[PDB]
Design a protein around this ligand. Structure first.
Ligand code: CA
Ligand code: CA
Ligand code: CA
Ligand code: CA
Ligand code: CA
Ligand code: CA
Lengths: 48, 113
């Protein structure tokens, strides 16, 4: 078998990632927004 | 002053030191023309009673009306209440004014206005 690594002979086969050679463009999954609120919790305020 | 993120936007002398209680710093920052800066300051000061509403401050910027005792008036009327000619404020004729141009330079002392 070749998918295992032996250190003694520096034996480790070289291979490419399957996705790098053949892309599979499925877009993404972004139904919901995704926001970044301000630290205090309310930004601009006012005096009352 | 309010709307904290105002200091990143460009500003409006009228959207900072008019429609809002402002710092003379933002006033200074926006004015630099320190002569008119003193003028605007004089305005603010006299307009201390013209802070609100907005159009009242606009009129106080126009300066045709005297506010309160008349510190802000900047018109062209140079005649007494009874038609007597007004003496030059800086000149000593016919009286040497203890209160004159040197003592009150910030009122924009015109010829005899
Ligand atoms: Ca403001
Ligand atoms: Ca401000
Ligand atoms: Ca505002
Ligand atoms: Ca500023
Ligand atoms: Ca500003
Ligand atoms: Ca406005």
């Amino acid at each position: 078998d070749r998918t295992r690594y032996f250190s003694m002979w520096n034996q480790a086969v070289d291979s490419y990632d399957p996705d790098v050679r053949i892309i599979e463009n499925h877009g993404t999954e972004d139904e919901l927004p995704n926001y970044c609120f301000p630290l205090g919790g309310i930004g601009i305020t006012d005096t009352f | 002053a309010n709307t904290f993120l105002e200091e990143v936007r460009k500003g409006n002398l009228e959207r900072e030191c008019v429609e809002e209680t402002c710092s003379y710093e933002e006033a200074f920052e926006a004015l630099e023309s320190s002569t008119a800066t003193d003028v605007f300051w004089a305005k603010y000061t006299a307009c201390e009673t013209a802070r609100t509403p907005r159009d009242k401050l606009a009129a106080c910027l126009e300066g045709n009306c005297a506010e309160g005792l008349g510190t802000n008036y900047r018109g062209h009327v140079n005649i007494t209440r009874s038609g007597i000619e007004c003496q030059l404020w800086r000149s000593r004729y016919p009286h040497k004014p203890e209160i004159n141009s040197t003592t009150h330079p910030g009122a924009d002392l015109q010829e005899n206005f």
